[PDB]
């Protein structure tokens, strides 16, 4: 439990302050502080010293991975929000074409209005919901 | 009834003062007589005497007024500006020598009853004898 954790941040507080060497760096795209360093048996007897005079219960985990994602096809869809609540609606019919390109390119989008449809106040905020709903695959 | 025929007197005074009615009555007592004594005795009231109403001894008090000025209404000014009952029957004040107020710092008057009789600020301090602090007046 993460209660033992900050407790072992005190453990490290006297571990990273008696032996330079290693680097106690958390990962971003996953929680769990990572123990980086310059030695196999080194890191291991570190862990021993832990389970000796610091007694932590920490099922020494396998390092996790940051996983991005993508696609490979041109899909035309209908983002039609035909919903007229109690008068104000907030209805938004968005007709988008979506295109995919190389892994390493970057993020694109085009200021593409077929003639003059969607207001110029959605332009930097309709694509947000393209970005917004693209943090969660 | 009454808990303070003294402070009640002082009040009826305040009435006649604030209403401008030449004279007003207030029942028989020696102490009121002492006080009103002090009052005329420093040019404030117009006097007092042991009168009677219905068969009951009273003590009527006439009082002083100033000149009738114009402009902002005719209302002449008061002579007996204000009096405040200090030693209430809960705040039994007992001033002594080095004590004693200064009342309007210089003028006014303190009324205070001491070992010997009913004195005033300047008097009681001059005397060197003290007691209860009755009212203030200026």
């Amino acid at each position: 439990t993460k209660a033992d954790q900050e407790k072992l941040s005190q453990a490290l507080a006297r571990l990273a302050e008696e032996d330079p060497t290693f680097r106690v760096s958390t990962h971003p795209e996953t929680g769990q502080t990572i123990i980086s360093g310059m030695g196999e048996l080194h890191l291991e007897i570190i862990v021993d010293r832990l389970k000796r005079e610091f007694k932590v219960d920490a099922n020494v985990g396998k390092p996790q991975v940051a996983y991005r994602e993508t696609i490979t096809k041109p899909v035309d869809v209908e983002g039609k929000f035909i919903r007229q609540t109690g008068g104000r609606g907030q209805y938004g019919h968005v007709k988008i074409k979506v295109e995919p390109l190389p892994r390493g390119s970057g993020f694109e989008f085009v200021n593409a209005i077929v003639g003059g449809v969607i207001p110029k106040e959605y332009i930097p905020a309709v694509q947000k919901g393209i970005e917004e709903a693209m943090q969660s695959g | 009834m009454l808990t303070d025929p003294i402070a009640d007197m002082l009040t009826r005074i305040r009435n006649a003062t604030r209403v401008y009615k030449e004279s007003t009555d207030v029942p028989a007592s020696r102490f009121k007589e002492e006080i009103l004594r002090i009052l005329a005795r420093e040019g404030f009231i117009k006097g007092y005497e042991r009168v009677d109403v219905d068969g009951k001894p009273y003590l009527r008090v006439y009082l002083k007024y100033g000149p009738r000025r114009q402009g902002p209404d005719p209302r002449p000014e008061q002579v007996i500006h204000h009096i405040r009952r200090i030693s209430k029957p809960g705040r039994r004040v007992y001033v002594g020598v080095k004590e004693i107020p200064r009342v309007r710092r210089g003028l006014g008057i303190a009324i205070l009853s001491t070992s010997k009789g009913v004195l005033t600020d300047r008097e009681a301090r001059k005397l060197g004898v003290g007691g209860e602090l009755i009212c203030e007046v200026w």
């Binding site: 900050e6 941040s9 958390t26 | 809960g90 705040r91």
Partner: protein, 125 residues
Amino acid sequence: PTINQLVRKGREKVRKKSKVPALKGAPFRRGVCTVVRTVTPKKPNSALRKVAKVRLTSGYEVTAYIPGEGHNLQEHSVVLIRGGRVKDLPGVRYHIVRGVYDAAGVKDRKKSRSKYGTKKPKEAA
């Protein structure tokens, strides 16, 4: 309350509450921390502000902020529990310092160097 009742009872002293339980007499503390995030102040902002949870050397998961732009802080820093809420982050209490064990101010700062780190801008010229 007529003198009597006043004497029988009492007009109680206001007391405080300390709108700032940094506690022990310790508004200076070892801010261990966890997380960073962003959060927003009422209807006219949006920023960063951390959350530094701290643990002090006595407890509490607070909301330790930061002295502004120029960050690193990751997860330890000894964020120096300090003090002062605003209309931002339902807390903003017990600020950070920069300097401490970590941060040491904005990369290049010319004013608030009394917390914003940078020593004495000797441009050596």
